[PDB]
Amino acid sequence: HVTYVPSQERNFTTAPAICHEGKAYFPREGVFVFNGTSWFITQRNFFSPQIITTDNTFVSGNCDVVIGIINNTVYDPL
């Protein structure tokens, strides 16, 4: 049997969702990570930082019901 074993763990600061002009952005697949400067989105099994854009996230509701939501910005490609 040939198998894949992950290794070399690293700790990050995470959030459930992000608020942006009164709307909540949840990731499609992946997790929100913080690297000391800004917030990125990454896959759970490998570390590959990506910029949080509108393609990465989706909108559901306003920001007064989710516990632990934070303020950040979302880059629109225009």
């Binding site: 459930p16 559901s60 019901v65």
Partner: protein
């Protein structure tokens, strides 16, 4: 029995703290709400459903545990397939004695 109890306690603690990642390899820490979100995402339901109804889901979880406890405090035959083993062993030895 103490060793088996320690094994089950370690498994429940690892599930409640690390989730699912300690079987593939080294344990990865994760808060319980995000793990619940992944479990919800695995059955085809988006994770905002968890994040907007967390109080109700937690209350239903606690109520179900309490109902299991109340079901197990009353005398019943829930563990009836563990009694058959000890009955069969005792009856076989007594059958040799009577034989």
């Amino acid at each position: 029995d103490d060793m088996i109890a320690a094994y089950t306690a370690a498994l429940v603690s690892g599930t409640a703290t690390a989730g699912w990642t300690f079987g593939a390899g080294a344990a990865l820490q994760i808060p319980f709400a995000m793990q619940m979100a992944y479990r919800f995402n695995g059955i085809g339901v988006t994770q905002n459903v968890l994040y907007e109804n967390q109080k109700q889901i937690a209350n239903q979880f606690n109520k179900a545990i309490s109902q299991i406890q109340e079901s197990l405090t009353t005398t019943s035959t829930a563990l009836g397939k563990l009694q058959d083993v000890v009955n069969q062993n005792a009856q076989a030895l007594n059958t040799l004695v009577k034989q």
